[PDB]
Amino acid sequence: GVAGGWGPWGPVSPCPVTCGLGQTMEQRTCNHPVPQHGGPFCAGDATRTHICNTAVPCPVDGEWDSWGEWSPCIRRNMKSISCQEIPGQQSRGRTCRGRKFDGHRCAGQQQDIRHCYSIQHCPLKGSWSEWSTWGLCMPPCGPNPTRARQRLCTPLLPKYPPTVSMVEGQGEKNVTFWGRPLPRCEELQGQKLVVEEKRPCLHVPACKDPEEEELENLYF
Amino acid sequence: DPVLCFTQYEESSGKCKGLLGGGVSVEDCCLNTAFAYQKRSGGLCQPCRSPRWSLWSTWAPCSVTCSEGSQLRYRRCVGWNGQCSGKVAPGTLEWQLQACEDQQCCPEMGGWSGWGPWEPCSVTCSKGTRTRRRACNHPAPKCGGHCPGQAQESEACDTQQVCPE
Ligand SMILES: *[C@@H]1O[C@H](CO[C@H]2O[C@@H](C)[C@@H](O)[C@@H](O)[C@@H]2O)[C@@H](O[C@@H]2O[C@H](CO)[C@@H](O)[C@H](O)[C@H]2NC(C)=O)[C@H](O)[C@H]1NC(C)=O
Ligand SMILES: *[C@@H]1O[C@@H](C)[C@@H](O)[C@@H](O[C@@H]2O[C@H](CO)[C@@H](O)[C@H](O)[C@H]2O)[C@@H]1O
Ligand SMILES: *[C@@H]1O[C@@H](C)[C@@H](O)[C@@H](O[C@@H]2O[C@H](CO)[C@@H](O)[C@H](O)[C@H]2O)[C@@H]1O
Ligand SMILES: *[C@@H]1O[C@@H](C)[C@@H](O)[C@@H](O[C@@H]2O[C@H](CO)[C@@H](O)[C@H](O)[C@H]2O)[C@@H]1O
Ligand SMILES: *[C@H]1O[C@H](CO)[C@@H](O)[C@H](O)[C@@H]1O
Ligand SMILES: *[C@H]1O[C@H](CO)[C@@H](O)[C@H](O)[C@@H]1O
Ligand SMILES: *[C@H]1O[C@H](CO)[C@@H](O)[C@H](O)[C@@H]1O
Ligand SMILES: *[C@H]1O[C@H](CO)[C@@H](O)[C@H](O)[C@@H]1O
Ligand SMILES: *[C@H]1O[C@H](CO)[C@@H](O)[C@H](O)[C@@H]1O
Ligand SMILES: *[C@H]1O[C@H](CO)[C@@H](O)[C@H](O)[C@@H]1O
Ligand SMILES: *[C@H]1O[C@H](CO)[C@@H](O)[C@H](O)[C@@H]1O
Ligand SMILES: *[C@H]1O[C@H](CO)[C@@H](O)[C@H](O)[C@@H]1O
Ligand SMILES: *[C@H]1O[C@H](CO)[C@@H](O)[C@H](O)[C@@H]1O
Ligand SMILES: *[C@H]1O[C@H](CO)[C@@H](O)[C@H](O)[C@@H]1O
Ligand SMILES: *[C@H]1O[C@H](CO)[C@@H](O)[C@H](O)[C@@H]1O
Ligand SMILES: *[C@H]1O[C@H](CO)[C@@H](O)[C@H](O)[C@@H]1O
């Protein structure tokens, strides 16, 4: 029946981190007064913890934003190349965002170029597409959601070369089509461009918090 | 205002894992953008990373097990100090509602036909049971219907005959 107690607390650990918050701890022993024959023990905790606060933020590596909108398809020293066999070059832009506190720079080309034709506002013969896939019930949670599918008059793109030898770049680069044409086609039920049809969605569920909807169905 | 500061944010489920402790400001906790925080411990664990839309949850069960219905799924803006895409503050919700169809047809219960004749008594001496039965075929049910009630009734019958000793 010997009562143990604590000895001196040892050295506190240094703040293990170089940014933000971290945790330190001190270690003591029950070595100076020792518990003999199993009677009483040491009261307490043999480990205290404490937060240490580095006042410096952590690095945050920048991430790529999504691609911008394709620029207008043009050609140097020729003005508008619309509805013509004139391959141009259009560009796109990304933004590196979020880099702070000596974080790594974004890795990759921030620009993107490709060769193109220009069919901006060009009158093209068209043909009526089949019924698109039934969309989402919109407005979601709003009054009376409704779906919508649609057939639209798709243009027949002109048979232009999709593979062109660029003389300035000395490369055989691909060429795609950019722009909003004006598709000509026989009317489909009083409409020349797009004919849709809506149907109401049935038995709409109410919109509540995902925790609240979980606790509501559990309780009934 | 102090908050509970957690060391890791679990993606896919939104829980605050690995508690570093409490009684520290939100600004100090989120110096390390890999951390996460929860206030009053009621819920709503927010990571310290810049705000970005979470993933679309799985589709909720269809609002009805019968014919065309409607099902939701959510998406929360998670982060701290900033906005998600849409000029949206952290914590808001966005929903998509979709038409669902678990099964084609739906249970239409039927109607009982006429009662069948009473069967004879179940015994030839002392007392027994008399039973009559009917069918659920006027009209017959489609998909998973069933007539309301029981397809047979029973009742006691007395033969008025003593058994051989
Ligand atoms: C269009 O061409 C690409 C590759 O060639 C060009 O891509 C442009 C975007 C531009 O950057 C230009 O400078 C570049 O030269 C074709 O990709 C190839 O596709 C085939 C089959 O689909 C694959 O087997 C190849 O691996 C793949 N890459 C390469 C380098 O050849 C693409 O198919 C083509 N599109 C069409 C419709 O013809
Ligand atoms: C100490 O110096 C800082 C300038 C950063 O470079 C620190 O990097 C960070 O270290 C902690 C763990 O110690 C990680 O949680 C962070 O992801 C990391 O950015 C460095 O340790
Ligand atoms: C989900 O499962 C189905 C098989 C039905 O049992 C649904 O129950 C309800 O059945 C009646 C028919 O008596 C229908 O009118 C209802 O539309 C349907 O909700 C069940 O919810
Ligand atoms: C019909 O007629 C009665 C007069 C009896 O002969 C019946 O047989 C008896 O049935 C009971 C139990 O059902 C038995 O305990 C008797 O042993 C038997 O005699 C008969 O079915
Ligand atoms: C050790 O810890 C504390 C003192 O720091 C007390 O609970 C007790 O003296 C124990 O021996
Ligand atoms: C450790 O902690 C304090 C000193 O910081 C005292 O209570 C005692 O010395 C214990 O061993
Ligand atoms: C732009 O390019 C494609 C989408 O067109 C993806 O790789 C990504 O979204 C990038 O930002
Ligand atoms: C450019 O190309 C098409 C539009 O022609 C789309 O994929 C998108 O708008 C991109 O920016
Ligand atoms: C429009 O499109 C084609 C003809 O261009 C046919 O599918 C039909 O005449 C429709 O009205
Ligand atoms: C849409 O409607 C039916 C299919 O639901 C067919 O006539 C055709 O596919 C049309 O595009
Ligand atoms: C919408 O309706 C059904 C699916 O719900 C199908 O006929 C088709 O996918 C259509 O787009
Ligand atoms: C839900 O919607 C699409 C996938 O259906 C993606 O933009 C993303 O996964 C989002 O969470
Ligand atoms: C709903 O949609 C499909 C299944 O129809 C999956 O992406 C997933 O189960 C979601 O909840
Ligand atoms: C048969 O039983 C009763 C009528 O006896 C009703 O519940 C119903 O008409 C069912 O078909
Ligand atoms: C049989 O039982 C009574 C008549 O005895 C009625 O509820 C009905 O005619 C049923 O078929
Ligand atoms: C039994 O009861 C009477 C005859 O005893 C009638 O209502 C009918 O024949 C039933 O089956």
Numbering used by the authors:
A (entry chain B): 255 to 474
B (entry chain A): 28 to 192
The paper states:
Whereas, the disulfide bridge pattern in six thrombospondin repeats were those expected, the three cysteine bridges 32–56, 43–73, and 57–75 in the N-terminal TB domain differed from those annotated in UNIPROT. We therefore confirmed the disulfide bridge pattern by two orthogonal techniques. First, an anomalous Fourier map calculated from data collected at λ = 2.48 Å confirmed the three disulfide bridges. The deduced disulfide bridge pattern and a homology search conducted with a preliminary model of FPcΔ3 showed that residues 28–76 folds into a TGFβ binding (TB) domain and not a truncated thrombospondin repeat as earlier proposed. In summary, comprehensive structural data and mass spectrometry analysis demonstrated for the first time that FP residues 28–76 fold into a TB domain.
The point of convergence is the cleavage of the 186 kDa complement component 3 (C3) generating the C3b fragment (178 kDa) which becomes covalently associated with the activator surface. The C3bBb complex is the AP C3 convertase, which catalyzes further C3 cleavage. In contrast, properdin (FP) is a direct positive regulator of the AP and stabilizes the convertase by associating with C3b in the convertase and proconvertase, reviewed. FP oligomerizes prior to secretion, and in plasma it is found in a mass distribution with roughly 25% tetramers, 50% trimers and 25% dimers.
